[model samples]
Target: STGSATTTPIDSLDDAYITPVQIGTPAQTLNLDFDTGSSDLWVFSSETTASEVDGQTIYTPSKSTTAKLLSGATWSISYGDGSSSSGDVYTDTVSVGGLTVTGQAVESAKKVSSSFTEDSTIDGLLGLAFSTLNTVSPTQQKTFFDNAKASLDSPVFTADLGYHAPGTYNFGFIDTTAYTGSITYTAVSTKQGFWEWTSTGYAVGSGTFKSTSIDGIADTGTTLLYLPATVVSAYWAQVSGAKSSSSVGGYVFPCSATLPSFTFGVGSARIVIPGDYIDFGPISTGSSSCFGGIQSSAGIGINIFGDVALKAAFVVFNGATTPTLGFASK
Candidate 1:
C-alpha cells in the first residue's frame, strides 16, 4: 500500500507545487496544488463560468461516468480577507501517484479562486488538512489521506519539498534515503485544523538558539516562512540595509547583502534555512531591493513554517489517532 509521486513547482519562485491527479474511468489527469494547510479536494471545473477558466485546466465531471453528483451537497470556503470560493460536490474515483480512493468528494468550483487568479499554473488545490475543516455540508467529507490511509501500509504521508526544483510526496512509509542523520519527532495539536506544533526556538546564522516556545503551523500552502515579529526582526537586524516596507511587501533588503542563515528547532533537531532562501530574489525586475522570505507572523496570529522553511528538510505528517510531525535534514 505504499505510493509516491513527483511534485513540481509552478513557478520560478517555487510559489506552489502541483502533483498530477487522475480522476474517473478515462483517466483525466490534472495538476493541483497539494496543500497541507486546509481541507476540501476542490478544483476548477468545466461547470465554471468562462471567466473562471482563464487558461487553466478544468475538471469535466460530466465527461466521466464514474463521477456521481452529490445532490444537495454544496461547499463554500473563505480565503481569508473576505475572498471566497463555492461550488457543488461530486463523488469520483480519484488517484494520486498510485494511491487510489473511491467515492471521494470532489468540489467543482463555481469560481476561479477564492483569492487571486494571478497564478495560472495552478489549476486547483488538493487539500491535506484535517477533514474536520472541510466546508462541504449535509456531510463533511474525508480528505484524500483520510480515505487512502487505511489502504496505506502505514497511515502517514511525507513531503520532501525541493528548492526551485521537483520534489517528492510519499505515502504509507517514510523514504529512509530521502534524508540524513535522524528524524526528529514532535507532537501535533490539530484542534485548529492545521499541522500545528510548537517549535523550540531559532538561531540567526551561527548565533545561539534562542530558547522559546514558537507555536506555529507547518503549512505547505503558504509561500513564506513567517515567525513571530520579534524573531523575524532579529534575523533582519543582522543584515544591513533591511527595512520593513508594508506599503506592498514585508521586509525588503538589499539584494546584494549576504543574509545570515535561519535555523529553527524541531524537538532537539535543527533545520537550517539557507541564506539564499531568505534573499527571496528581487521585488521588481532589476530592482536592487529584494523581498525577505522570512517575514513576521504579526497579524496572522500563528507563526507559519511554510514552503520557505519546509524546503529545508523532509517532513512527515503522521496520522495516528493523535498525530505527530517528523522532520529530517536532507
Candidate 2:
C-alpha cells in the first residue's frame, strides 16, 4: 500500500503530456492530461454525445461492474483558455501507474468545448491541485492524488516536463537521479486551489534582478508563461524588432533576433530560463517571425508558470500539511 507509480508522456503535441490511468472493475484505461491548475477527473465517455466527441477516445462505465452512478450529482469545469466540459458523476476504483484508490469519483463529460473536440488526442484531465477544487455538486470530490496520498510512503509527486523529448510524472517518491543540485524549497499558499508561490523578483536576460513580489501558480495545463502586462512589456522591449502584434498574437519578433534569457527569484535561489526557450516557435512553418513564449496575463488575473517555465526546472509538489514546492536544476 506504500508503493508508487511513474507515468511517461504519451506524445509531443504542444508538449501536453498525457498519463495513462485505469478506472472501474475490469479497468477502463484512458490517457489523461495531469493538470495541476484545476481539480476534476473528467473524461470523454459514453455519456458524451457522439456529435460532440471528435477523434478522442471515450470511457465506458456501463461495461465496468464497479462503476456506480452518483445519483443526482453533476460536475462542470471551464478553463482560462476557454476549454470546458460538464457531465454526471460516477464512483469507481481508479489506478495510476501502480497506485490504486477505490471508490474514486470520476466525472463523465456529456458536453465539451470546441477546443477540446478538436484536440483529438486529449481524452480528459486528471486534476491534482486540491480536493477543495473538485467540481462535483452535493458533495465535493477528492482528487486521485488526495485519495492515494494517505497510503503512500510519502505524500509527494514530481513533474518532469520536457521540451522536445518525453517526460515523466512520479508519485510518492523523489527520483534523485532525475535532478541536479540541491532542491530549493518554498512555502506554497494554496488559498486558490493552486500551488501559488511568490517570486522575490525577476530579470530579463542577465540584467539586475528586481525585488518585487509576484504571486502566481504553477499550472501544468497551461502551454505558455504568462506574466503581468507591465512585466511582459519590459521583456519584449529588450528584444530588437519585438512588438505586440495583434495579427500574429502576443509579442512576435524576427526569428533572427537574439532572444535573451529570463530569470525569476525563488526565495534566494534564481531559476534561469534559457533564451532559446523564450522563443516559443515560429509564427508559421517557414515564417521568419516567432512568438514569445512568455506573454502578458491580461485577462487572466494571476500570473501562470506554465510548461515554458516549469520545463526549465525539476519541480517537486510536496503534499505536506503546509504544502511546499521544491525546485532544482534538471
RMSD of 2: 1.8
Count of steric clashes across candidates, in order: 0, 0
The C-alpha TM-scores of every prediction are 0.97, 0.95
Reference-based lDDT, residue 82, model 2:
77
Estimate the TM-score for candidate 2: 0.95
User: How much lDDT does each candidate structure score?
Assistant: 0.89, 0.86
Winner by TM-score: 1
User: What is the per-residue lDDT of model 1 for residues 31-58, given as tens digits with 9 covering 90 to 100?
Assistant: 8888898898888888777776676778
Clashing pairs in 2: none
Q: What tens-digit string does per-residue lDDT give for candidate 2 at 203-291?
A: 99978998888889988888889998988898999999999998877999999999898888788888888888787668888999988
- Worst 10-residue lDDT window for candidate 1 reads 111-120
Model 2 steric clash total? 0
